[PDB]
Design an enzyme around this catalytic site. Structure first.
Site, mmCIF file in Angstrom:
data_model
loop_
_atom_site.group_PDB
_atom_site.id
_atom_site.type_symbol
_atom_site.label_atom_id
_atom_site.label_comp_id
_atom_site.label_asym_id
_atom_site.label_seq_id
_atom_site.Cartn_x
_atom_site.Cartn_y
_atom_site.Cartn_z
ATOM 1 N N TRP A 47 -9.147 6.006 -1.383
ATOM 2 C CA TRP A 47 -9.393 6.742 -2.602
ATOM 3 C C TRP A 47 -8.337 6.355 -3.620
ATOM 4 O O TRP A 47 -7.321 5.767 -3.269
ATOM 5 C CB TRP A 47 -9.419 8.256 -2.348
ATOM 6 C CG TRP A 47 -8.236 8.808 -1.622
ATOM 7 C CD1 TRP A 47 -6.989 9.030 -2.133
ATOM 8 C CD2 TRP A 47 -8.195 9.247 -0.262
ATOM 9 N NE1 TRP A 47 -6.173 9.582 -1.169
ATOM 10 C CE2 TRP A 47 -6.890 9.723 -0.011
ATOM 11 C CE3 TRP A 47 -9.138 9.284 0.773
ATOM 12 C CZ2 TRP A 47 -6.501 10.224 1.233
ATOM 13 C CZ3 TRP A 47 -8.754 9.801 2.010
ATOM 14 C CH2 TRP A 47 -7.446 10.254 2.230
ATOM 15 N N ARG A 86 -0.229 4.552 2.883
ATOM 16 C CA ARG A 86 -0.180 4.300 4.328
ATOM 17 C C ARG A 86 0.126 5.513 5.226
ATOM 18 O O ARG A 86 0.075 5.388 6.440
ATOM 19 C CB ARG A 86 0.777 3.152 4.657
ATOM 20 C CG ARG A 86 0.237 1.771 4.393
ATOM 21 C CD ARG A 86 1.289 0.756 4.771
ATOM 22 N NE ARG A 86 2.245 0.552 3.695
ATOM 23 C CZ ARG A 86 3.392 -0.103 3.834
ATOM 24 N NH1 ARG A 86 3.729 -0.595 5.019
ATOM 25 N NH2 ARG A 86 4.205 -0.254 2.792
ATOM 26 N N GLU A 145 -3.868 4.079 -11.065
ATOM 27 C CA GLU A 145 -4.644 2.848 -10.991
ATOM 28 C C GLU A 145 -5.720 2.861 -12.056
ATOM 29 O O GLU A 145 -5.994 1.841 -12.693
ATOM 30 C CB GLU A 145 -5.321 2.706 -9.637
ATOM 31 C CG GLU A 145 -4.391 2.621 -8.468
ATOM 32 C CD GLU A 145 -5.185 2.531 -7.160
ATOM 33 O OE1 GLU A 145 -5.695 1.421 -6.851
ATOM 34 O OE2 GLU A 145 -5.316 3.571 -6.477
ATOM 35 N N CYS A 192 0.804 -1.223 0.000
ATOM 36 C CA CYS A 192 0.000 0.000 0.000
ATOM 37 C C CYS A 192 0.838 1.276 0.000
ATOM 38 O O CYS A 192 1.552 1.558 0.965
ATOM 39 C CB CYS A 192 -0.951 0.033 1.209
ATOM 40 S SG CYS A 192 -2.108 1.431 1.142
#
Ligand code: HEM
Ligand code: HEM
Ligand code: M94
Ligand code: M94
Ligand code: H4B
Ligand code: H4B
Ligand code: ZN
Lengths: 404, 403
Positions: free
Chosen positions: B279, B110, B284, B107
């Site tokens: 979000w 973070r 992506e 991730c």
């Protein structure tokens, strides 16, 4: 099912198993508790086992495993180590070994070419003057007026007691890095240390962003001697852009020939401390890494202001827009100058073809994903979606400590 | 022993000592590194993981060795000894969910880990109730475009029975319809799930962006079909700031990335349904969802509209079309006032996170291949950052598909 790493391509949904990693005789930096794969830099009994292994590899490559010549070579090496503590490679073993080293290099995306490598035997070299001559001949042959040819020149191996042959420079062609009195650097900051070493060793320094470094060449047990390359042997490519006319005014250039000279070539326990090799560039090495890295020429903001981009906010993607045009200029200028270059799409495509070749040839291919995936447009190239297994095979190119 | 971690842009070195707290093995061995693989190939145990987690919790509130700490260890001990398992208090669950996010090596988001709304949905007895909790989750998380990270936690796995499962990989996904001639209309990643919804009685559409119904499974029962109230699903029409033909492509994406197929493991307990959302980072949507060859694959189309030389790789048409697509995503979200972050800002804040975590814990588990964005990798600072990957608990894990 099978007791080997399962490898998946996520684009094509295809599976392979890597069996080749079983032949790894050396452990990398990873453990079950933590992965360290992203890190850049993490005795007659031993020699003989390593030499036996290589001779076995060699005779297998020429399809004579178990043969009489195979076993005689085995005995020839064992006796030789038993009298001198070391042994010598036959010429063809050296050619095979140098190719296998390249073939084995997990971080090289250009390995489809591995079988096409000119090997220069320079194991007779006995001076630094002589090393210079071989290096010049290499640059000439490999540069070939722009039609680049892969090559390696192999200098005498490490000897017990005796000192090493070393080329102090990291590449045969490198731009000087001049530290300024205001903390900044003119030229390539990657090469500050070697620039300072050249100066201390008698070099008269320039003050351009693109001054070609002299070679510092070290024969055994002797101080390194300084050799200037004659300019005509060093092919450079002035960079321009196909549509942005101002780009040529930036005065950027790069050298044609990537010629790595600080790596150790290990074959069958024998260590070649000087064995410079060269290929041709992938465009992203020059366009993204050498020209756009913050700790290199760092010209991204410069180009972006010329492109009139909003450099006040990340979300304009000005970094990405500028990087693309720089890469395009590297590509266009090399093509215009008729100097061999390959873009990251063509390179990665050819690497997938290499992975399929090696899958059939050897049951796998050692590959370092972070290095194989290009530094821009990662997921646009097919290697991004390819799982890869990383491991150390021998013969190998290895890093070595700087001579000083 | 302890890994020497280097940043090659700044020359600075840290040492990761947090990795010593790892009790779960990864896929690498000394013989070979498998760090680029996407997926993996009783009472003594549970009690030790439970003690360890309770210890982390009371340490987090600065109450170790205290009386409440001791009594809580004895409750867990007594409950496991009698029932083979135990239950988390809501406070522990909130802490656990945050630690799982904090510990997730892949991730990039973070920096946000301490701001997570945790919904306790452990009093769920049916697919119908899961749907209610999910709708509330989406309503909360979406918040009219001012996105807020959230997780909803459904009942934990139990020895006897089947799991609560959300069959969808994300709460909001576009259908992928396999046409007769092999090709796919819509999102190819979702052909299978789209087929499952149809078999279970969903009337399919024929669009490229048909929002899928949810397949919710209560233990040991067939999954049920629920259609998300269209007003609950915020979507963003894509347009380009300067290319006016771009909007004509009829491109769109949803606001809420809400992963629903992952397992949350806390103190040995496993939560098979625990959807979470934050979000989007723009790449992506722009790079992976729209440009990936096995997804919507729109690169060549956009390249033709820019009048690029598609004939050759050396014109970098792919690179150019991709950048304009990512710019289109950022522009369109910013214009629709829906939270989004570009990959530069994201990576900059992840470096800040690494620095915070270095002071707080002595390290930070990070998966370089996932943290470095899919375009313009070396143009972000994380590229030049060596990272150490390892597994800490609490953790999010992958789990089999329930079919
Ligand atoms: C023929 C064209 C070639 C191409 C396009 C090519 C491409 C590359 C590229 C793009 C890298 C990444 C380097 C970086 O980003 O710093 C690399 C690494 C490497 N290449 Fe190749 N290469 C070629 C020829 C060769 C040859 C002839 C050899 C040796 C005989 C070789 C051996 C290596 C090795 C050992 C590495 C890893 C270096 C390291 O670990 O620091 N390459 N190559
Ligand atoms: C707040 C904004 C957030 C951003 C910008 C963000 C960013 C990202 C990105 C870009 C990825 C790579 C995903 C992919 O390529 O498919 C990722 C992975 C991941 N994220 Fe975050 N995230 C956010 C919030 C959260 C939250 C709230 C959680 C959990 C509570 C979370 C947990 C995870 C996990 C477990 C992964 C690995 C997914 C996998 O292995 O498939 N993230 N994140
Ligand atoms: C900063 N990199 C650390 C190791 C290092 C140091 C100096 C140069 C270097 O080059 C790697 C390398 C090696 C061989 C290559 C062959 C061809 C090519 N196009 N690039 C190539 C690039 C690699
Ligand atoms: C294909 N990746 C492996 C499994 C999988 C399946 C479906 C969705 C998925 O998303 C990854 C993921 C997880 C959490 C996220 C949190 C925030 C965000 N913006 N993206 C996020 C993306 C991941
Ligand atoms: C930290 C990280 O390992 C480092 O930035 C690496 C990433 N990948 C790379 N890949 C290539 N080809 N060359 C490099 O120098 C690097 N550097
Ligand atoms: C094979 C490779 O590991 C795979 O394509 C990974 C690479 N890095 C990634 N990084 C992110 N953020 N998301 C991904 O899905 C992937 N995929
Ligand atoms: Zn590893």
């Amino acid at each position: 099912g099978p007791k080997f790493p399962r490898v998946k391509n996520w684009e094509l949904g295809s599976i392979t198993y890597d069996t080749l990693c079983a032949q790894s005789q050396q452990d990398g930096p990873c453990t079950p508790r933590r992965c360290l794969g992203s890190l850049v830099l993490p005795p007659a009994e031993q020699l003989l086992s390593q030499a036996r292994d290589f001779i076995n590899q060699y005779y297998s490559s020429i399809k004579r495993s178990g043969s009489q010549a195979h076993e005689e070579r085995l005995q020839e090496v064992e006796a030789e180590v038993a009298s001198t503590g070391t042994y010598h490679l036959r010429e063809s073993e050296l050619v095979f070994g140098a190719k296998q080293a390249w073939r084995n290099a997990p971080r090289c995306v250009g390995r489809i070419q591995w079988g096409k490598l000119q090997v220069f035997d320079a194991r007779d070299c006995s001076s630094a003057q002589e090393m210079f001559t071989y290096i010049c001949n290499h640059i000439k042959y490999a540069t070939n007026r722009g039609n680049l040819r892969s090559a390696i020149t192999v200098f005498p191996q490490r000897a017990p007691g005796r000192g090493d042959f070393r080329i102090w420079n990291s590449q045969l062609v490198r731009y000087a890095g001049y530290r300024q009195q205001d903390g900044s650097v003119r030229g390539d900051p990657a090469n500050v240390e070697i620039t300072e070493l050249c100066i201390q060793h008698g070099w008269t320094p320039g003050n351009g962003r693109f001054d070609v470094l002299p070679l510092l060449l070290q024969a055994p047990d002797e101080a390194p001697e300084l050799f200037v390359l004659p300019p005509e042997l060093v092919l450079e490519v002035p960079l321009e852009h196909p549509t942005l006319e101002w780009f040529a005014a930036l005065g950027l250039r790069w050298y044609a020939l990537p010629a790595v000279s600080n790596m150790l070539l290990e074959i069958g326990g024998l260590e070649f401390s000087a064995a410079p090799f060269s290929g041709w560039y992938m465009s992203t090495e020059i366009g993204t890494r050498n020209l756009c890295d913050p700790h290199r020429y760092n010209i991204l903001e410069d180009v972006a202001v010329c492109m009139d981009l909003d450099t006040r906010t990340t979300s304009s993607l000005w970094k990405d827009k500028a990087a693309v045009e720089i890469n395009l200029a590297v590509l266009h200028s090399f093509q215009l100058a008729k100097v061999t270059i390959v873009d990251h799409h063509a390179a990665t495509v050819s690497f997938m073809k290499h992975l399929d070749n090696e899958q059939k040839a050897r049951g796998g291919c050692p590959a370092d994903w972070a290095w194989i995936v290009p530094p821009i447009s990662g997921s646009l190239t097919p290697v991004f979606h390819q799982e890869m297994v990383n491991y150390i095979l021998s013969p190998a190119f290895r890093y070595q400590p700087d001579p000083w």
